[PDB]
Amino acid sequence: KKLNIALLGLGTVGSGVVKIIEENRQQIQDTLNKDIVIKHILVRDKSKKRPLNISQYHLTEDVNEILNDDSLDIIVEVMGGIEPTVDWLRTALKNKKHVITANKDLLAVHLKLLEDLAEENGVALKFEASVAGPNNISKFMGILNGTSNFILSKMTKEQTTFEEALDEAKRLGFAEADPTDDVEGVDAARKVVITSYLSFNQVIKLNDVKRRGISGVTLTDINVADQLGYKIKLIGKGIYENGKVNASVEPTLIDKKHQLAAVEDEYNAIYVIGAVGDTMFYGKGAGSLATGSAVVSDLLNVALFHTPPHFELEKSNFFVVVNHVKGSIENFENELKAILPFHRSLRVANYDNQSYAAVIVGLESSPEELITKHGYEVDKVYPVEGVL
Amino acid sequence: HMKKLNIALLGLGTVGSGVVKIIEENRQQIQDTLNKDIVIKHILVRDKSKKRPLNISQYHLTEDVNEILNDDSLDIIVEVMGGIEPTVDWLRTALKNKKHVITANKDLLAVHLKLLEDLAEENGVALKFEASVAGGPNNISKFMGILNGTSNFILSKMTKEQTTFEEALDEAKRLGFAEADPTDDVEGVDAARKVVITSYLSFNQVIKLNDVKRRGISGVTLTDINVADQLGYKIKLIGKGIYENGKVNASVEPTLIDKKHQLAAVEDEYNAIYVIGDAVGDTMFYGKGAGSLATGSAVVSDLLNVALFFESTLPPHFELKTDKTREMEKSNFFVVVNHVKGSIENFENELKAILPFHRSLRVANYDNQSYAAVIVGLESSPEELITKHGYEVDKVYPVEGV
Ligand SMILES: N[C@@H](CCCC[NH3+])C(=O)O
Numbered sequence: 001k002k003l004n005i006a007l008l009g010l011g012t013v014g015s016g017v018v019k020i021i022e023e024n025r026q027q028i029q030d031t032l033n034k035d036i037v038i039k040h041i042l043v044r045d046k047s048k049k050r051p052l053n054i055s056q057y058h059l060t061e062d063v064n065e066i067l068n069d070d071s072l073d074i075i076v077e078v079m080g081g082i083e084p085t086v087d088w089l090r091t092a093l094k095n096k097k098h099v100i101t102a103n104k105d106l107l108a109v110h111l112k113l114l115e116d117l118a119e120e121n122g123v124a125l126k127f128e129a130s131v132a133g134p135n136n137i138s139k140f141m142g143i144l145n146g147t148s149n150f151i152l153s154k155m156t157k158e159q160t161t162f163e164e165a166l167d168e169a170k171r172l173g174f175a176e177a178d179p180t181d182d183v184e185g186v187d188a189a190r191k192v193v194i195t196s197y198l199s200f201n202q203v204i205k206l207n208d209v210k211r212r213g214i215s216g217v218t219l220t221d222i223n224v225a226d227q228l229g230y231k232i233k234l235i236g237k238g239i240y241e242n243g244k245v246n247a248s249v250e251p252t253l254i255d256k257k258h259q260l261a262a263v264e265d266e267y268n269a270i271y272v273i274g275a276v277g278d279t280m281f282y283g284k285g286a287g288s289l290a291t292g293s294a295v296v297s298d299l300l301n302v303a304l305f306h307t308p309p310h311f312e313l314e315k316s317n318f319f320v321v322v323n324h325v326k327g328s329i330e331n332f333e334n335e336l337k338a339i340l341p342f343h344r345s346l347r348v349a350n351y352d353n354q355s356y357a358a359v360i361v362g363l364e365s366s367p368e369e370l371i372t373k374h375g376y377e378v379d380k381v382y383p384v385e386g387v388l
Numbered sequence: 389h390m391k392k393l394n395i396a397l398l399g400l401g402t403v404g405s406g407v408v409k410i411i412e413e414n415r416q417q418i419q420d421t422l423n424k425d426i427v428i429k430h431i432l433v434r435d436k437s438k439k440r441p442l443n444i445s446q447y448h449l450t451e452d453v454n455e456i457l458n459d460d461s462l463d464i465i466v467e468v469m470g471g472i473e474p475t476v477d478w479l480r481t482a483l484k485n486k487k488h489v490i491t492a493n494k495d496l497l498a499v500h501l502k503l504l505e506d507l508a509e510e511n512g513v514a515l516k517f518e519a520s521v522a523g524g525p526n527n528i529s530k531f532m533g534i535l536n537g538t539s540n541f542i543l544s545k546m547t548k549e550q551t552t553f554e555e556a557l558d559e560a561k562r563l564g565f566a567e568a569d570p571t572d573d574v575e576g577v578d579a580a581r582k583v584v585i586t587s588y589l590s591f592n593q594v595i596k597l598n599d600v601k602r603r604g605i606s607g608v609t610l611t612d613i614n615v616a617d618q619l620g621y622k623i624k625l626i627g628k629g630i631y632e633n634g635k636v637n638a639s640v641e642p643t644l645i646d647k648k649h650q651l652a653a654v655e656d657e658y659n660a661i662y663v664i665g666d667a668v669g670d671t672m673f674y675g676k677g678a679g680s681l682a683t684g685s686a687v688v689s690d691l692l693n694v695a696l697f698f699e700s701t702l703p704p705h706f707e708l709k710t711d712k713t714r715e716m717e718k719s720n721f722f723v724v725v726n727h728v729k730g731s732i733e734n735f736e737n738e739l740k741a742i743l744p745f746h747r748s749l750r751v752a753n754y755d756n757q758s759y760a761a762v763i764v765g766l767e768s769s770p771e772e773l774i775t776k777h778g779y780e781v782d783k784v785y786p787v788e789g790v
Contacts, residue, residue, distance in 0.1 A: 019711030031705050051714050259674060262653040277676035282650055284669030289715055311413035
């Protein structure tokens with residue numbers, strides 16, 4: 001059987017997909033009795049140079065040339081983008097074409113509507129390559145952005161300011177000139193949306209993820225956390241309780257003994273809680289060749305071509321920084337004991353001149369508003385995780 | 389239009405019982421969903437007079453494996469018996485008789501999986517052994533793992549609570565982690581089996597159990613741990629496979645791990661596999677071992693997979709990725725010497741004079757007239773060399789994460 005495919009996009013991932021198919025073509029014929037023909041490649045601009053170099057494939061700038069080709073069996077999309085890309089994929093599925101996508105901009109809303117449209121039209125939608133950082137899961141926590149983690153590691157290990165650490169990340173290639181997507185936690189929040197969809201089968205919106213970036217984390221925060229037994233990481237978290245997902249991305253104190261506390265520099269990790277023990281997956285972000293390899297894997301799966309469950313038969317902790325405090329640390333601790341609702345434990349630390357930090361274990365919600373209404377100036381509050 | 393899938397179970401221990409319960413509890417669902425009716429037609433047991441729960445008495449129990457192997461109505465054989473002989477021959481026969489085989493046999497090694505996988509492909513049927521391995525998975529060049537929960541638990545206890553090996557092992561016994569004869573754990577045999585398996589899955593190479601150079605943890609002392617600690621290292625029992633120049637070098641032994649390495653943080657009964665490759669970053673998988681219900685659940689999962697693809701990937705197939713063209717190691721040692729006269733400065737100076745070229749050397753007090761050295765960047769163990777220069781070498785552990 002000839003399997004006629006088209007590629008939408010030819011960047012590093014697209015080029016990699018092509019090379020992998022070329023290199024394995026004879027093997028795929030001999031083994032699976034399938035002949036993969038790349039009949040069209042959509043590119044934005046036919047003139048640009050590429051890792052493929054000058055090649056033998058038909059390049060087009062007109063997507064309709066691909067979407068109207070009824071001889072196509074499978075569309076491989078490596079273009080990125082939501083518009084017009086998602087509409088292209090909707091058309092392909094409506095035309096009874098299998099779709100494999102490595103589109104990093106897709107969110108849960110998009111994957112859901114594409115998965116349904118695929119099922120509806122009797123074809124496959126594969127998005128394995130779209131994720132890169134895969135059992136009743138109740139909670140996950142992750143370090144999901146390499147650049148922000150790199151910055152925090154640098155601040156921590158080398159005792160530099162955020163500004164110095166970000167400049168170093170810029171010169172080393174990790175951060176871009178406008179590093180907002182990394183530093184403000186947007187990239188991490190996207191991965192929290194995707195991870196929540198995969199873990200809980202629930203669709204949340206990007207703006208449902210309560211998000212704070214790292215630009216306000218200081219050495220003082222890091223060193224106070226250190227003395228209390230914690231590192232600071234930008235943590236993306238999803239908690240699935242009572243039919244609802246609470247999702248967030250924010251600077252978080254993590255107990256030094258926690259597996260996540262050791263994840264440094266540009267490495268990422270996803271820590272999954274469920275019943276069973278915890279599990280964790282650790283590694284850097286893929287990986288053009290890895291992404292390309294995952295696409296081709298999904299491709300062979302579809303070429304070799306529903307669900308899933310089976311037989312059954314928590315408080316929060318907080319790091320609070322308060323400024324303009326008159327009086328001693330002992331007095332502050334006593335006042336805090338008097339003000340707080342019932343909780344499990346409290347420790348206080350010096351933070352700066354007339355500033356103290358408290359870690360409070362076992363509250364239902366942030367004591368920020370409460371402490372504010374009692375007349376204190378709260379600088380900020382970070383969650384605390386890994387507490388045993 | 390419902391198709392009956394006739395299966396047999398070889399063995400009915402905790403895993404076998406769990407497999408049965410899971411199938412029972414999900415039977416209606418598997419019919420309604422996949423339009424498949426799973427019928428457990430035979431269960432092989434060692435002793436069929438033995439009293440069993442009521443649910444088991446509904447099934448046909450036999451002590452004669454041939455009754456199962458000769459039953460042409462069987463579609464799938466699920467083996468949860470364990471053992472190499474006669475168990476592997478049973479599975480060979482099943483495959484030759486065109487029966488799919490799902491196994492959770494914990495005694496299977498690479499030699500066995502290889503011959504069964506080939507025999508399966510050869511006969512147009514599936515061999516599934518997912519349940520035979522505990523989770524936590526292209527060009528992998530090296531892996532390092534903490535592969536035995538009990539030994540890791542013991543080392544964590546020694547380290548955190550400052551106990552001797554003997555005290556930590558007794559505690560592991562009392563707490564349920566170690567068994568009464570803990571040899572398989574403590575001597576690193578279990579870990580060596582997993583290194584054979586991990587090497588087969590990572591490198592597609594078959595090694596024998598006796599090719600794995602093995603040392604357990606029973607000789608690790610609190611002094612080793614505390615001296616390692618002061619030098620910046622933890623001690624773990626590490627199972628390692630290095631694939632260099634067509635050959636696998638495989639080992640299990642006490643190993644100093646830099647405290648900043650991801651493996652250093654893996655404590656208690658948790659396991660982890662750390663995987664290194666060209667040209668991607670390192671990866672690691674972390675979690676505890678199975679798990680009778682988990683093993684049983686994995687068997688049933690493999691079962692449904694074989695059911696779904698029943699009416700329809702060759703083991704020989706590997707995706708070539710030498711378009712890495714288009715897109716684009718030394719050893720370290722911890723050496724303990726005893727009966728050393730003279731100062732630590734003198735020991736360090738002598739080592740500097742006698743060692744071949746290396747990246748760094750640090751020395752520490754170990755005990756009375758005993759010193760330890762960590763040496764980074766040698767081509768091979770300096771043990772013989774140090775011995776011929778008149779030092780009593782107590783032992784040498786590899787050092788990783790440097
Ligand atoms: N305390 C023992 C530990 C055994 C190490 C064996 N390699 C000794 O003196 O060697």
